Design a protein around this ligand. Structure first.
Ligand SMILES: CO[C@@H]1O[C@@H](C)[C@@H](O)[C@@H](O)[C@@H]1O
Ligand SMILES: CO[C@@H]1O[C@@H](C)[C@@H](O)[C@@H](O)[C@@H]1O
Ligand SMILES: CO[C@@H]1O[C@@H](C)[C@@H](O)[C@@H](O)[C@@H]1O
Ligand SMILES: CO[C@@H]1O[C@@H](C)[C@@H](O)[C@@H](O)[C@@H]1O
Ligand SMILES: CO[C@@H]1O[C@@H](C)[C@@H](O)[C@@H](O)[C@@H]1O
Ligand SMILES: CO[C@@H]1O[C@@H](C)[C@@H](O)[C@@H](O)[C@@H]1O
Lengths: 88, 87, 88
């Protein structure tokens, strides 16, 4: 069994769908034409997601969890980086 | 154990809550009065959801997953149809 | 064996991350400074969440599920209360 998370933005629209399969999370993308594979590739058994626009710039936060460890991954216009999130 | 997904829109507001129970996903709806059962009824062990408005017209996408198969279901103003999503 | 759900709002932004661990759901909060522990503390094995603004006032709904029972929890400016949601 796979586990999914999804977010969207604009009126086109843009959609992003994160799938946790056998300990690896991957990303599928839609921008008003076809579905394609996105840059996001990280380890996880469980995923959630949220996003917001600042003007016309999209920002995404993905919460990947393995055992009891949860890692935030940030997209802000160029590539994916680790975020300051702590489970405290 | 049951597994849920939720989305909302407007300021009333409107809420939709999708519950995966014993391999069947069902929908519960709120539009500012009571909670009622919605049209959505499909197979799944796991669910996620997202939605957006074009003017006052709502569009919903639900991602129902059994085993390794994930099926997208589209609402766009009259009834539910299969979408172009592929894993 | 943790399970997460996330929501966000505004352009700062504000983020809320709900974690289901060993039958207890807890909340972590971000408002543009640090990550801190939030007021939300309720029983559950599974969680989902959604939120909306009326002007600058946030409203949050969290769906906490144990076995076949799902309980709605409402935030509307002034702590957390049970909501009218039923699963039938
Ligand atoms: C343009 O790059 C694509 O879209 C971004 C918004 C991200 O979802 C990224 O993972 C993907 O590769
Ligand atoms: C600016 O800091 C980055 O983005 C914030 C909105 C948070 O997601 C934080 O954990 C992350 O390090
Ligand atoms: C108008 O129809 C009701 O609201 C729609 C947005 C959908 O949730 C549908 O399944 C439900 O029965
Ligand atoms: C118009 O195409 C339908 O809606 C798009 C926004 C996507 O959900 C796509 O998978 C679906 O087939
Ligand atoms: C101001 O209070 C903080 O923000 C609210 C929106 C809630 O997330 C609450 O549980 C949290 O402690
Ligand atoms: C005022 O009523 C409360 O708020 C609504 C938006 C719903 O979440 C409902 O379950 C709850 O009873």
């Amino acid at each position: 069994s796979v586990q999914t998370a999804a977010t969207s933005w604009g009126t086109v629209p843009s959609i992003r769908v994160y799938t946790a399969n056998n300990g690896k999370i991957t990303e599928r993308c839609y921008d008003g034409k076809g579905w394609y594979t996105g840059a996001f590739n990280e380890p996880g058994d469980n995923v959630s997601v949220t996003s917001w626009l600042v003007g016309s710039a999209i920002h995404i936060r993905v919460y990947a969890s393995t055992g009891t460890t949860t890692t935030e991954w940030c997209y802000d216009g160029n590539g994916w980086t680790k975020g300051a999130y702590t489970a405290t």
